[PDB]
Amino acid sequence: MKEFYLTVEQIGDSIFERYIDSNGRERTREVEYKPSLFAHCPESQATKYFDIYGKPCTRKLFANMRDASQWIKRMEDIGLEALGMDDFKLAYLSDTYNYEIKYDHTKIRVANFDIEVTSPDGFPEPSQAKHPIDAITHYDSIDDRFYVFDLLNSPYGNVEEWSIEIAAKLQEQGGDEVPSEIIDKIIYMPFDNEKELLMEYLNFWQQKTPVILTGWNVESFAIPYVYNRIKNIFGESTAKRLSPHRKTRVKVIENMYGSREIITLFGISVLDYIDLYKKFSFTNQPSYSLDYISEFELNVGKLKYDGPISKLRESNHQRYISYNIIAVYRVLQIDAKRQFINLSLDMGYYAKIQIQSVFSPIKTWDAIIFNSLKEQNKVIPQGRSHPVQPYPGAFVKEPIPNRYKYVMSFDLTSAYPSIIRQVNISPETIAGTFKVAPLHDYINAVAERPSDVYSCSPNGMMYYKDRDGVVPTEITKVFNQRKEHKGYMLAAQRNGEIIKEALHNPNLSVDEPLDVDYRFDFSDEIKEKIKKLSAKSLNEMLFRAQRTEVAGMTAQINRKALINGLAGALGNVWFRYYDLRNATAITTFGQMALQWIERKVNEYLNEVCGTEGEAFVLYGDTDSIYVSADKIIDKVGESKFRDTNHWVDFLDKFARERMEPAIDRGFREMCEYMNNKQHLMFMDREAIAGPPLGSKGIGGFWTGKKRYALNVWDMEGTRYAEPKLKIMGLETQKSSTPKAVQKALKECIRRMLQEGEESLQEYFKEFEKEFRQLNYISIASVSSANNIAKYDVGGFPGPKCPFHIRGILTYNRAIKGNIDAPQVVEGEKVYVLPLREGNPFGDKCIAWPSGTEITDLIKDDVLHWMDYTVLLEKTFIKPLEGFTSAAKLDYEKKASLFDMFDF
DNA sequence: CATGTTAGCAGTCCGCG
DNA sequence: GCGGACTGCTGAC
Ligand SMILES: [Ca+2]
Ligand SMILES: [Ca+2]
Ligand SMILES: [Ca+2]
Ligand SMILES: [Ca+2]
Ligand SMILES: [Ca+2]
């Protein structure tokens, strides 16, 4: 097979590389790497090396990496550019792997681990590691085994061995319900003392050295804890054995009362699943406990236990170990679904970077662009210093707050990357400038055509048309992969709806799920078979379709994020290709594009509807338009439609056959106006929205910019079995809004859009009556707790203290002195509840770590002093008031003359 | 070491015969 | 009691 790297490090003048050889064996090597950098040279001097502007450079081959570094310093002192890749391990990767890397994940050792540490005196701080490690579960992807290290003897208690037989039993049977599919994969190893456990853990680690190291919170807890605990017992050089090159770096950061640390293990690529999840999932969660996330992702229940975790090992060591094991398996299950390890590997090898560098779009793009330019013997510019400067972004139309009955939406496919490609925006394609007219002069086609030679943006920039830019070139490759995966995702989505439709009429049969590829639209044969399937087979097929859709989602949305990240990086001062002329060329072109196409759509729709000056576009943001379709529907008359699906079909056809071709002509004109390289403004129909035919539903409403709700029947070609709400910006979409309040507000919206005012009033009345019976967690607000200390004046709120921070301080005073009360961690999330006047906490609110029950010592007092009136008014009524006033609707029946009668 | 800008709502502080 | 300037937080692109 073709060789590929696993890890790469620079240590002094050596490159340390772990890799997979031609026979598929893991190998390591130390290389005294001889880097090159480049300096500009006279034109007369023959060379094969040119900078991106075509100026000749001479190559400086260095005896070692330190020499290269020292040379950069001297060049800086002289005042001349030192060109070429200054991150030498990227250079090394590019030289060693001068071909498209084809990697084999089955040869890559991925390790998933977690540790337990009993602590009777508060959270066990990794930097101090003063408590024994009493469990480790380490899953190895190559062995497909869960290696369990179990401490039987501890200063905090001597316990018996863990029983695998009891672990497999149902909980209702006294067991731990360790999933049966991993029972046979567990290798269990008990130890009579911690030193033996840790020693054997290190020997194991040496035999099975992780390449990718993952797990839940491993970077902030497990890794530094293991490292510091081993250091305290055996010495630092023993602790350094966690690195295959025996090198680590300690990063102390650093709460300021007290502190913590991150450990770099050289020759390992740490990808903490919590970090993967936050970057790649596109959720914002109220809490990031593994229990919370597992439940959200997998619909498994909380791993319940009686008493505090500080006492679980002594009282129920059996459950303690099982739960250690399950927590490790849960990360694997989340990854089986989400496939973030797969994505990280794809992206990392595609760029030729250290795998952990996928967290950095700038490092990722630097490597991609360097490799691309290198292949053509071109030489990359030196990184330069730049002050941070603000610059303009997108246009967002101010909508008239209102109900909007029938709506059709359109937006640009991959807007900013498409703008980059259309205009040919790259550092090396800049041709010059032109004198700018006011933006609205371009929007209304009155300004002079900028150029008849070059491709233009209304920011004043001109670009060559007849040559490729590396930025356009490389952004296109990633865009094309994105498009492939999104296609797979949407096919799976459409496939899912076919299955949901068939679930209305399941067959009474024992049969099998159909063996199909969900990435492709079902054929007629498959659809016929589906209509004969049982509920069992259908539901299983639906699970598989949704898993296929999630996988396509992960793959497409993050490649979308990466290409959009390139457009953003042009405006980040650390990017090698930072240039506000290029960043603003994109954003300004976007502003024109949106407002240009608004004009064109209003013009077209007036023409075809036989009218003039009516506003059809009611809203737009960056690259989208929202078109009121009321007049389209009224032109033919609602009477003519059989059911909802008929008018949906009608608008679908109208958008595709009439509007889109009008839009396309509109944008082709704009392309010629800017004399662009290639027409790439593709504005496809997004949503078709309206109330059910013959209902009192209002269809949609806007309260303002970035705030709206739509009852959607068709979304990018997916015709739903059941209407789906598209809600943006409203409190239902915010992780700070209480769970049950999100739910109730969403049902309030569903009822408004689908059913009418009366239905809304019915639900409101009921929710108001029952509010006080909801679980306290379900009705608590959520916030991030940043800069707690800044507002901590003797345990009391200082000036300008935010509400949620006040709550934390109230909590800190209530718990002061209690050894095992969970501390609020700086920067993490808290639940927040308001308190009534005269409460024993001495303040108007309390807050505590989110995803958790509030400590039992104060729980009852919280429950008793909870201010429901404030909670209902703030979280539920006030947002609902905003929705309903905008929609011109009442959530309570207003008083009127009819109140004089007895109905 | 290192994607971007635009934007609304909740809260504090302050003024206000 | 309620606005306006302000910080903080949270999303929509
Ligand atoms: Ca644990
Ligand atoms: Ca778009
Ligand atoms: Ca059937
Ligand atoms: Ca959009
Ligand atoms: Ca689309």
Side-chain angles (χ1 to χ4, degrees):
Chain A
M1 68 176 303
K2 257 298 175 72
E3 303 189 6
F4 60 99
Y5 67 89
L6 298 163
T7 65
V8 64
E9 306 287 5
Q10 184 196 337
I11 302 177
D13 290 333
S14 276
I15 291 292
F16 277 92
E17 188 201 356
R18 300 170 66 196
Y19 68 103
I20 299 290
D21 74 19
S22 61
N23 302 311
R25 178 124 285 214
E26 176 171 340
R27 308 266 294 276
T28 306
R29 61 188 165 202
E30 183 177 5
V31 186
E32 304 159 344
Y33 180 61
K34 296 204 273 185
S36 300
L37 298 160
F38 305 74
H40 285 128
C41 66
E43 199 66 60
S44 62
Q45 200 203 292
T47 172
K48 71 204 192 107
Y49 308 102
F50 295 92
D51 77 11
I52 64 164
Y53 312 102
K55 316 267 101 186
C57 301
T58 182
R59 176 162 77 121
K60 301 277 164 200
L61 214 207
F62 293 99
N64 55 67
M65 282 177 290
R66 274 157 188 170
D67 286 2
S69 291
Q70 287 295 106
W71 183 76
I72 287 167
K73 289 169 173 286
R74 291 194 301 273
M75 287 299 273
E76 183 191 291
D77 294 347
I78 295 172
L80 292 159
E81 196 179 357
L83 295 86
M85 176 52 62
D86 57 311
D87 191 334
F88 304 125
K89 61 198 174 297
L90 294 196
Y92 173 90
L93 289 189
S94 183
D95 285 338
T96 311
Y97 302 99
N98 206 67
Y99 52 85
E100 189 190 352
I101 289 168
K102 159 89 154 176
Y103 75 95
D104 181 354
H105 79 92
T106 71
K107 311 297 197 208
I108 306 179
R109 202 179 293 281
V110 182
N112 203 294
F113 86 123
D114 201 19
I115 73 168
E116 308 299 337
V117 174
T118 294
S119 163
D121 54 51
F123 177 74
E125 295 303 328
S127 66
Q128 309 309 130
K130 69 173 166 185
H131 297 102
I133 301 168
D134 56 33
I136 303 175
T137 295
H138 181 120
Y139 173 88
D140 177 283
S141 73
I142 286 177
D143 293 356
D144 193 31
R145 297 295 185 259
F146 301 81
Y147 296 89
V148 180
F149 298 75
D150 182 9
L151 182 61
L152 305 181
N153 295 332
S154 178
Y156 306 136
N158 293 354
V159 294
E160 296 285 22
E161 295 192 351
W162 163 87
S163 163
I164 197 153
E165 291 85 0
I166 290 171
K169 288 190 186 177
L170 299 175
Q171 288 201 14
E172 303 87 353
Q173 198 180 351
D176 305 314
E177 268 173 51
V178 172
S180 58
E181 80 272 7
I182 74 173
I183 273 296
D184 283 337
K185 297 177 176 183
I186 295 156
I187 291 169
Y188 171 80
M189 295 163 281
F191 295 88
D192 266 6
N193 67 78
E194 189 193 2
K195 286 164 188 157
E196 279 286 303
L197 182 157
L198 294 178
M199 269 192 276
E200 182 60 52
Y201 188 67
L202 277 171
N203 289 160
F204 162 84
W205 187 282
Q206 291 209 173
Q207 289 310 286
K208 305 173 203 293
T209 311
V211 172
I212 308 302
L213 185 56
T214 189
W216 201 256
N217 221 45
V218 288
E219 203 166 65
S220 60
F221 182 68
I223 293 154
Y225 202 103
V226 176
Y227 184 81
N228 283 307
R229 184 70 183 169
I230 295 182
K231 165 162 66 72
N232 295 345
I233 293 164
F234 293 107
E236 198 185 58
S237 43
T238 299
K240 281 190 220 285
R241 292 172 65 209
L242 286 179
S243 162
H245 313 305
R246 305 310 182 250
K247 185 177 173 70
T248 65
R249 176 188 283 112
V250 183
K251 184 65 84 284
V252 187
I253 168 84
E254 181 48 74
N255 205 111
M256 290 192 78
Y257 227 90
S259 65
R260 37 177 305 281
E261 56 178 48
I262 283 97
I263 307 308
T264 302
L265 300 180
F266 282 80
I268 298 176
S269 294
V270 179
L271 306 177
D272 195 325
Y273 218 89
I274 194 180
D275 295 320
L276 292 174
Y277 188 93
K278 289 169 170 182
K279 185 168 169 57
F280 294 138
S281 78
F282 291 84
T283 64
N284 195 6
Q285 299 291 15
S287 152
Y288 287 93
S289 81
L290 184 48
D291 268 341
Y292 194 93
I293 299 289
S294 296
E295 170 160 313
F296 180 87
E297 289 296 324
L298 312 164
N299 276 241
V300 292
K302 196 177 80 186
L303 285 344
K304 225 224 85 186
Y305 57 89
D306 302 342
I309 212 285
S310 84
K311 286 165 185 171
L312 180 58
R313 182 184 170 268
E314 61 185 280
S315 54
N316 203 332
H317 173 252
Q318 175 61 48
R319 182 146 281 170
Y320 193 70
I321 294 302
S322 290
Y323 280 7
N324 181 228
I325 293 159
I326 291 170
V328 176
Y329 184 45
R330 281 174 165 200
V331 187
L332 296 166
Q333 297 179 107
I334 293 158
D335 196 61
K337 177 191 189 187
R338 288 296 203 145
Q339 304 172 183
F340 295 153
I341 300 285
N342 178 68
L343 172 68
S344 301
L345 291 178
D346 274 12
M347 277 181 46
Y349 286 117
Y350 181 89
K352 288 160 188 174
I353 52 178
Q354 295 182 131
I355 305 303
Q356 63 268 39
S357 294
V358 298
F359 290 113
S360 176
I362 277 166
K363 173 68 57 180
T364 301
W365 277 116
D366 200 43
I368 289 160
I369 291 162
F370 156 62
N371 279 280
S372 195
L373 294 164
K374 175 164 157 278
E375 282 294 314
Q376 299 187 302
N377 286 346
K378 296 179 173 185
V379 178
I380 73 180
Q382 192 172 10
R384 287 158 159 118
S385 193
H386 318 279
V388 172
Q389 286 180 314
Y391 67 93
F395 179 77
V396 182
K397 192 191 165 59
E398 184 77 60
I400 305 164
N402 213 341
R403 65 174 68 172
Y404 291 92
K405 187 170 188 182
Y406 290 103
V407 174
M408 260 189 302
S409 65
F410 303 78
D411 71 284
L412 293 180
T413 298
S414 186
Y416 283 10
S418 297
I419 291 176
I420 286 178
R421 301 171 53 213
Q422 167 145 337
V423 183
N424 203 28
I425 298 158
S426 197
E428 85 282 30
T429 59
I430 299 174
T433 59
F434 62 94
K435 267 164 65 165
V436 296
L439 190 68
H440 280 71
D441 281 351
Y442 296 112
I443 289 159
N444 296 311
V446 290
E448 200 194 317
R449 194 172 185 241
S451 172
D452 61 9
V453 176
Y454 304 118
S455 160
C456 301
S457 175
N459 85 321
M461 292 291 297
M462 305 194 306
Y463 301 89
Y464 294 110
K465 295 182 71 171
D466 47 8
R467 66 196 61 164
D468 298 298
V470 66
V471 164
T473 302
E474 292 304 325
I475 216 178
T476 295
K477 300 187 192 168
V478 181
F479 170 71
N480 287 335
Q481 297 164 359
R482 189 261 173 150
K483 181 200 221 160
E484 181 192 346
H485 295 284
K486 182 174 173 164
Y488 302 156
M489 183 189 81
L490 292 185
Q493 204 175 73
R494 294 187 297 266
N495 283 336
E497 301 301 318
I498 300 179
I499 291 158
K500 289 176 183 174
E501 286 284 358
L503 269 163
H504 295 323
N505 294 102
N507 295 68
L508 304 167
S509 295
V510 170
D511 49 28
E512 283 297 305
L514 260 17
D515 188 34
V516 295
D517 196 347
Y518 299 94
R519 290 176 311 162
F520 303 100
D521 289 301
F522 294 152
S523 66
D524 290 349
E525 171 148 81
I526 290 150
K527 288 194 275 206
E528 293 312 299
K529 299 198 175 219
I530 274 160
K531 290 184 214 143
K532 279 142 194 150
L533 286 183
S534 68
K536 183 179 161 62
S537 286
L538 281 177
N539 279 133
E540 183 52 25
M541 285 192 70
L542 183 60
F543 180 73
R544 290 158 184 203
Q546 293 177 144
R547 282 306 173 94
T548 308
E549 179 186 346
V550 171
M553 173 66 101
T554 295
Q556 76 84 21
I557 211 181
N558 291 287
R559 282 175 177 80
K560 165 187 176 185
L562 184 71
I563 59 182
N564 290 345
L566 181 57
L570 290 162
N572 179 288
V573 302
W574 305 101
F575 192 42
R576 191 177 306 272
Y577 310 100
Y578 172 78
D579 197 336
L580 254 38
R581 298 172 299 160
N582 288 340
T584 63
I586 298 156
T587 63
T588 315
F589 190 100
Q591 286 204 18
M592 179 181 71
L594 175 44
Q595 287 164 102
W596 177 279
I597 216 55
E598 176 185 18
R599 177 170 67 73
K600 290 292 188 171
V601 165
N602 287 334
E603 277 168 16
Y604 174 75
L605 288 180
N606 279 283
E607 172 187 293
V608 300
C609 289
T611 68
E612 219 151 315
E614 288 184 42
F616 288 88
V617 174
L618 67 109
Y619 183 64
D621 176 346
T622 308
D623 72 329
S624 60
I625 56 170
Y626 292 79
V627 183
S628 179
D630 292 9
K631 291 289 168 60
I632 312 300
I633 291 294
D634 296 334
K635 241 295 186 292
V636 311
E638 271 199 347
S639 305
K640 256 78 162 79
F641 301 105
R642 292 173 248 109
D643 45 22
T644 305
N645 197 57
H646 188 196
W647 72 248
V648 172
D649 266 349
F650 176 65
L651 297 180
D652 181 27
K653 204 172 180 197
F654 195 89
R656 186 182 57 258
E657 292 184 346
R658 305 298 181 169
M659 291 195 68
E660 276 170 19
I663 287 168
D664 186 72
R665 283 189 297 282
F667 274 133
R668 284 188 186 266
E669 184 168 293
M670 195 186 87
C671 190
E672 275 176 50
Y673 193 30
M674 295 291 113
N675 194 35
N676 292 144
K677 193 171 184 301
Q678 183 182 9
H679 164 55
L680 292 165
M681 300 291 101
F682 305 148
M683 182 174 254
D684 299 342
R685 194 268 296 171
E686 184 213 14
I688 293 163
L693 217 214
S695 82
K696 303 191 174 194
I698 64 157
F701 66 87
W702 266 257
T703 77
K705 289 168 174 189
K706 280 153 199 287
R707 280 177 69 91
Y708 64 91
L710 290 171
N711 187 54
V712 175
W713 302 89
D714 195 289
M715 183 77 166
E716 298 188 282
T718 301
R719 187 69 57 88
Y720 298 127
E722 297 292 330
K724 183 140 141 46
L725 301 182
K726 195 210 170 193
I727 305 172
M728 294 306 294
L730 309 190
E731 282 71 10
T732 51
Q733 305 312 109
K734 294 164 86 178
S735 65
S736 50
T737 297
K739 258 262 188 70
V741 174
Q742 291 173 332
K743 270 206 65 176
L745 289 176
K746 188 170 193 221
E747 175 72 1
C748 286
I749 294 156
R750 196 198 53 80
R751 286 179 175 246
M752 292 171 74
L753 306 193
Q754 297 179 0
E755 298 174 359
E757 183 176 52
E758 263 216 317
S759 180
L760 193 234
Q761 285 170 184
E762 184 187 80
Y763 192 73
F764 174 87
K765 191 170 283 166
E766 199 70 70
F767 186 76
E768 178 170 54
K769 277 146 96 163
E770 296 298 342
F771 184 70
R772 298 172 177 255
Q773 290 310 302
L774 301 154
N775 186 246
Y776 73 112
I777 283 157
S778 76
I779 50 173
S781 299
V782 176
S783 198
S784 301
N786 295 305
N787 296 290
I788 309 162
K790 193 220 271 217
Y791 297 104
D792 198 328
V793 180
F796 294 93
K800 302 159 182 182
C801 184
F803 189 83
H804 64 287
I805 305 291
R806 172 177 305 267
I808 288 151
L809 302 175
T810 302
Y811 174 76
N812 295 346
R813 295 192 309 269
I815 64 152
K816 202 225 79 196
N818 272 240
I819 328 290
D820 60 31
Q823 305 303 128
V824 170
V825 187
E826 160 72 28
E828 299 214 305
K829 290 190 174 173
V830 296
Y831 288 132
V832 183
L833 286 171
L835 272 0
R836 304 188 309 273
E837 196 102 1
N839 71 74
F841 299 98
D843 223 333
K844 63 180 171 160
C845 60
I846 197 163
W848 72 101
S850 71
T852 77
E853 290 281 342
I854 196 162
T855 182
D856 286 310
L857 16 143
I858 57 178
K859 187 177 171 177
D860 294 342
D861 288 289
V862 179
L863 295 166
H864 194 254
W865 289 90
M866 273 178 86
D867 194 336
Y868 290 98
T869 300
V870 163
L871 200 55
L872 181 66
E873 250 295 326
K874 264 151 51 154
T875 63
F876 181 74
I877 294 166
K878 202 168 172 197
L880 187 59
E881 158 66 18
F883 308 167
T884 56
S885 57
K888 305 191 191 308
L889 221 39
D890 290 306
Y891 64 83
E892 291 178 298
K893 198 176 175 189
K894 266 163 75 269
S896 69
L897 270 17
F898 296 91
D899 301 332
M900 304 292 101
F901 296 95
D902 182 5
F903 303 115

